[PDB]
Amino acid sequence: MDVDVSTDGELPGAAEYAREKIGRLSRRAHRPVLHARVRLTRHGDPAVERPVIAQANLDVNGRQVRAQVEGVNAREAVDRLEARLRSRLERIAEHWEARRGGVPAEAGREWRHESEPARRPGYFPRPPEERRIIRRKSFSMVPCTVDEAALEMEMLDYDFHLFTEKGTGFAAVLYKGGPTGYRLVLVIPVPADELSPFEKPITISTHPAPCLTQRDAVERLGLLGLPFLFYIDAAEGRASVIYRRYDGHYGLITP
RNA sequence: CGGCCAACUACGUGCCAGCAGCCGCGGUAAUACGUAGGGUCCGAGCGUUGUCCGGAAUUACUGGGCGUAAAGAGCUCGUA
RNA sequence: GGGAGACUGGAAUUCCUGGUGUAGCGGUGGAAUGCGCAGAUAUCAGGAGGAACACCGGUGGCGAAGGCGGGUCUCUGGGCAGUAACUGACGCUGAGGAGCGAAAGCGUGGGGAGCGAACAGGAUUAGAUACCCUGGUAGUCCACGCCGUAAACGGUGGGUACUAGGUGUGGGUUUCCUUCCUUGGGAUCCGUGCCGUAGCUAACGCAUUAAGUACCCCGCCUGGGGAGUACGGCCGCAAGGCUAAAACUCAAAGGAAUUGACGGGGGCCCGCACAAGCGGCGGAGCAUGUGGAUUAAUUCGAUGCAACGCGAAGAACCUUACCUGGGUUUGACAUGCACAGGACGCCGGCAGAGAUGUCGGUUCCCUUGUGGCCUGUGUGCAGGUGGUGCAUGGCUGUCGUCAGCUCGUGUCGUGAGAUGUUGGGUUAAGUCCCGCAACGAGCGCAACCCUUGUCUCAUGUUGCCAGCACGUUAUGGUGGGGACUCGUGAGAGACUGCCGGGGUCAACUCGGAGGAAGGUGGGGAUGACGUCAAGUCAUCAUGCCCCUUAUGUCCAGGGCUUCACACAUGCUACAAUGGCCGGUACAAAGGGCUGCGAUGCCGUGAGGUGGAGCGAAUCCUUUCAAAGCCGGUCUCAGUUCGGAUCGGGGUCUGCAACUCGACCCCGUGAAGUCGGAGUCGCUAGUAAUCGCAGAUCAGCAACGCUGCGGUGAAUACGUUCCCG
């Protein structure tokens, strides 16, 4: 490390002492230092109790660390400047050991500015305690085609819709298939040829709607995280679509 | 003879010499250092030191307190 | 869930055994030690063992305190309510004393799954005897005993009586709604919380569970350290515990609360702050400034933002304040008290580097009292870029053109202080609206000013020329003309003015019409209280100190330009989006009298001669530019790039270009191949790039500064990170 000292007036021996005292702080800086300068001045007025003024500037990897002290002589000023610079460099570290106690920790305990925001679902929580099923629509079970079902979707502003298919005579549910288009799920999977003709670009889910109970359906919805579950009820034997409502209850659509 | 505490100016000196009961005054322009004027309190006396009481409700009988300022035993039983 | 003893239940962790089964498992902010490939992890079945008891489960119960919940049984302590049968003050407290007393720790004997001091490696770090990771011994567990400490806290000793209430919750008795289901409600006794009177307190707060009002008993305190330490003593296997000083030293140590400041605290916002981009710096040569070194001197000031092309808008001499040497002293320059005068003053010669000295010619007008000049003699005195911007004024920077900073009265608090200035919304804004123990006001914001973008009226010279005539190429050049520009006077025009929608029908906000311009249109001038003892005793002034035959003053020469290096600001480049040559088109602004200076002529070119016309909308700076466009050539090379350095020859200014000017001509032809860590500027006529002009100025170090125009981009998803 190389230091330049720009003294002023009569300060014999201050330059060497300041050089050798400040150059020892290179190991303290955790990043390479560049062009570290020091300046010594003396107050002309004898009325000042601490006439000597010392200033130091270091460029630690682009970060400017500067300090300034007053003293009665060159030696005291240089020593105080060294202590001040050491404290500043300690507060500057920014390496992991010095930035590990401020990084957000745990999952829910403690909150910080950069702590990860809580993931909130669209629905009101309404935990399993008194969740209940307080919405049961049975809008339409008149047979429809894919295009007619899509239009019945669109003006209802509902992502999924349960109807009964024209060609099959079976219950089916359409939903937005994402970027792939739309997706159709039937109680028993059938190919497109048996399905009534359509013009919208859709795809058919190959899996069949399984048979399961109400509590099992709620458990599957909870452990599978889908926006809804379409299934054949075990007791009823017919189609059913459960979705988490906008109040936290489950919306069971039945024929 | 800065304030407690009656009684201010000039010169000499400058973190020196020094003063001081406490707070604190000496860093070329000090009512706090030294000397001169001026002033005030006492007066055959005036100050300093040493000892005791008061102010000290600062051992609180008259006349104190214990959550956080010092102060409730770690908690019960029980002798005088 | 009060305590002790005995028996016993399940989930899960670990290990072992046996199947299926592969190449990873484990761990972190990221990894590595580690485990596994000899079959791990995963999955199933079986077995062994130890510890703790998910849900119930809480500010809910019990206990004097420590503390106490898997289930069942046995033994046992306490409490509450009702009846009030019974005894009849037998009550309260308690020095010493005895007993109980979390965890850790000690002794003997067992047990040991998980966790885990100590101890190993792994990782982070400048260093890690730590935080994080992989293992892991005591210990945690049981039996019998020791110790006797805790933030053993409600930091609140025990008993009693009284002093507004309101509302949760645990236990028990009873009256009335009455279904008599129901926390129905009431009454009452005993607990356990929250809010709140009076009252108390320094305040925070306590407030029928007192820290209120009083009585009885006990313990404890007398400033902070030294110190709960030493000595002595008691207890203990030991660790150590209990009792417990002094010397010396300090003028304080402390409790509560207020205003700031700060935070690797939170929330809401801003800014080229970041993000997306464009161009750079840091690498090279040169210009400039600074540090350091050097020197006789390298005059002085300025040191992050806010010093470092700054004071310096012009250092050869002068400037100049520094050095060497030579002179000078009421002085280089002022004004007053005096003595003598008619000269001071000039002009030539000589000596000297010059200052200066000397020589030669010239000599006052008033008016008799003297005045103007200087001489010397003097005497007050001048004169200091000598010191102190921590004694100052004045001037300036900066936070920051950010939105904030205060005051009057009122109110609250013992007081510092608080409210207003907070809260919701909105804005560029403490801008505004609605609320509100506040009601108002002031400096700040905005507006009033300049410029710019549109139009109308007025307006025609040196400015335009559209329609008319003369023109000679040379063109508004000339007569003429207000028509279009332009010049400069007045005025209009943006005011959420209008419409639609959000909005508390409020501020305000989104969109639309109109208009040249739509929402402070674009840019300026303007910088609140103050901060940083910021800068300036070198623009100036100035208190105090200092010099005064000198730190004043005159002159010559030199220095401020020195250079083994370091930092900063810029310019030119590294080339084909280019170099060179030829042709050719478009600006704005500004300057000019002892200055701009044209035509012509002479030089290759700086330039020389010469002087037309101009104090200038006229003449000159050329009629003005360069980038630009067209044509030719060069062909990816240290080159036809780059220009440094050096040799020779000249011009101009200046008394004088050696130290130390600029420019011109010929030759010479270095580094340099787009530049590490890092870092800067910029949101539109902007960045980038091109040229012109001005101040200072005899000449210039100007590539610097201040303005003017030409051509003119990319990007902004959005506030997580950096700075303020």
Added chain:
RNA sequence: UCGAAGGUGGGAUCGGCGAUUGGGACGAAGUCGUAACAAGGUAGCCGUACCGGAAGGUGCGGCUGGAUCACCUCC
């Protein structure tokens, strides 16, 4: 016989010195580190135990005289 003084002996108790050695108080500027105070960058403190150049670290139990927890949609 008692009897002062004196002699002998083993102890008590109060002080002084003591080679070496422990800690304490203060000292602008020395050396090594950042422990605490803003969540002080690993919350702090109390009792106890072990370890470490040093502040200190860790294990068990306890206390708050520890900071923050944006947004939060149903109603």
